[PDB]
Each structure stands twice: as structure tokens, then as C-alpha cells.
């Protein structure tokens, strides 16, 4: 987004820097993440519309930025369940509540997008997950035979189609702000991957 904003209230948790629900894991310990309550999770009624985002967070004792891990689910609008290390740098960890303003930012990244495809997948059906993006992905399709084919975005932060075909994939992928790019990934096998994997992309949101 370049601007956006949001109010509710914020509380914290140990959670979310593994077995996350959108599988973005491995989360180093030492990074500042959030779960988000799922009214503005599934933004625009794109499933995970916000997974994989990052939010600049603004309590009574400052502002801090977060990344997006996980689903809270018992979450209001506006609602967040922060990181410690997130938390006490905006508020008081005496407080289990505090009020907050949010909003989505660009994430402090470098590079391109990296892909991940999960297990399972293959040319009958693949879930592909985007990581590494500065704003948040709301759509990816991919190419069959001259047409563009839509790919369901899913609670677990991966893009799913079926039938997709053989051969590499021609991707475009468009960001909250309706910007698009487009990449190509490598062939789907014509069984089910063993292993998920990732695979570096090569293109990026525009600043
Ligand atoms: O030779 C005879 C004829 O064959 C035809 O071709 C057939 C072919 O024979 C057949 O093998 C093939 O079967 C494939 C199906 O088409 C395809 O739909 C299926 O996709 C499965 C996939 O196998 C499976 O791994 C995947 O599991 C997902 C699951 O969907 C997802 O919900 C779950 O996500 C959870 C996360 O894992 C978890 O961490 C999180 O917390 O929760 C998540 C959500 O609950 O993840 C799992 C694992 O990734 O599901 C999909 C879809 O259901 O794969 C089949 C095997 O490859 O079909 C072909 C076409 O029908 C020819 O057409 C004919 O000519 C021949 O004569």
C-alpha cells in the first residue's frame, strides 16, 4: 500500500515463528512478526491477502515494523497479536492490551521474489507460495495455452490451481496497490513433489 491505515488493539504471544499458519517458516527468533485477525487477513476476499505483508505499528510508547505470520483467530478488526520483542517497543509488557494504529507498509527487503512449491505438487495440481514480496500479493495466474488462469490464493499462503500443464510456467503476480509482474518458474514434475522446495524468482513489486 503506499498509504493505509487501521486501528484496534494489540495484545502478545510466544506463537507464530513456527508452524504458522502460512507456512513461511523458518522464522529467525530474533525477528519482529505479528498474527493477524482474519476480517483484514482475507483482505478484498482474497484468502491470505495480507500473509507474508509487513506492518508498521504504532502504540502509546512508539512505532515499530512487523512482519505477518500467522492467523488470530479469535481477533477483532483491527486486532494484532505481536511479538515480544515487537510488543515492548511500542508498549508496556505490564499491559495485556494495548490501543494501536497500523498500516500496511513496503517491505525492508532486497532482491526478488523466491518461491515455494509445496509438496504434493505437480502438473494435476500445485500450491505455490510467494515469499519475499514488498507489498502484498492479492493475485497470481499463470499462463495455459494463450489464456490466463487465476489461482486461488488459500489460508495456508500458497496459489492453487490444477491441470496446469507441462513445461515451465509463465507467473503474474499483482500486489495490494493493483501492480503487476510478471516471471517464469520452472517445470511442474508429473508426479507429486516428494519435498516442498524453493525456487528463486526474478522479479519484484516496484518500490
Ligand atoms: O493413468 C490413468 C489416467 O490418469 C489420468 O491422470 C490422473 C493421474 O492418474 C492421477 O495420479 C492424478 O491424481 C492427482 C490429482 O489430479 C490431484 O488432484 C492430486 O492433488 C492433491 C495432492 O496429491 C495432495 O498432495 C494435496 O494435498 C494438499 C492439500 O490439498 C492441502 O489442503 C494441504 O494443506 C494443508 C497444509 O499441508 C497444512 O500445513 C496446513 O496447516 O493446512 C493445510 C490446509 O489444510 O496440503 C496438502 C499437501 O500439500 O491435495 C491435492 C489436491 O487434492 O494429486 C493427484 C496425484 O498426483 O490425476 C490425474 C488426472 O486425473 C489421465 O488423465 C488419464 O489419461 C490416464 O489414463
Known amino acids: 500500500a503506499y498509504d493505509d491505515l ?15 499458519a502460512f507456512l513461511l517458516d523458518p522464522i529467525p527468533s530474533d525477528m519482529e512478526i505479528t498474527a493477524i485477525n482474519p476480517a483484514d487477513l482475507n483482505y ?71 518461491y515455494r512449491i509445496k509438496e504434493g505438487s505437480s502438473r494435476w495440481w500445485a500450491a505455490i507460495q510467494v515469499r519475499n514480496h514488498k507489498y502484498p500479493v492479492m493475485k497470481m495466474e499463470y499462463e495455459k495455452d494463450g489464456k490466463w488462469i487465476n489461482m486461488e490464493k488459500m489460508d495456508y499462503n500458497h496459489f492453487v490451481s490444477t491441470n496446469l500443464g507441462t513445461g515451465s510456467l509463465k507467473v503474474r503476480m499483482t500486489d495490494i496497490r493493483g501492480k503487476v509482474v510478471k516471471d517464469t518458474i520452472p517445470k511442474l514434475p508429473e508426479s507429486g513433489t516428494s519435498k516442498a522446495y524453493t525456487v528463486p524468482g526474478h522479479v519484484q513489486f516496484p518500490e
Open 44 to 114: 478484498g476476499g482474497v484468502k491470505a491477502a495480507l500473509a507474508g505483508s509487513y506492518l508498521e505499528v504504532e502504540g502509546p510508547k512508539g512505532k515499530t515494523t512487523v512482519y505477518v505470520t500467522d492467523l488470530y483467530p479469535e481477533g477483532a478488526r483491527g486486532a494484532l497479536d505481536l511479538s515480544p520483542n515487537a510488543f515492548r517497543k511500542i508498549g508496556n509488557m505490564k499491559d495485556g492490551k494495548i490501543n494501536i494504529k497500523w498500516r500496511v507498509v513496503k517491505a525492508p527487503i532486497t532482491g526478488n521474489f523466491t
Open 6 to 20: 487501521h486501528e484496534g488493539y494489540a495484545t502478545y504471544t510466544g506463537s507464530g515463528y513456527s508452524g504458522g
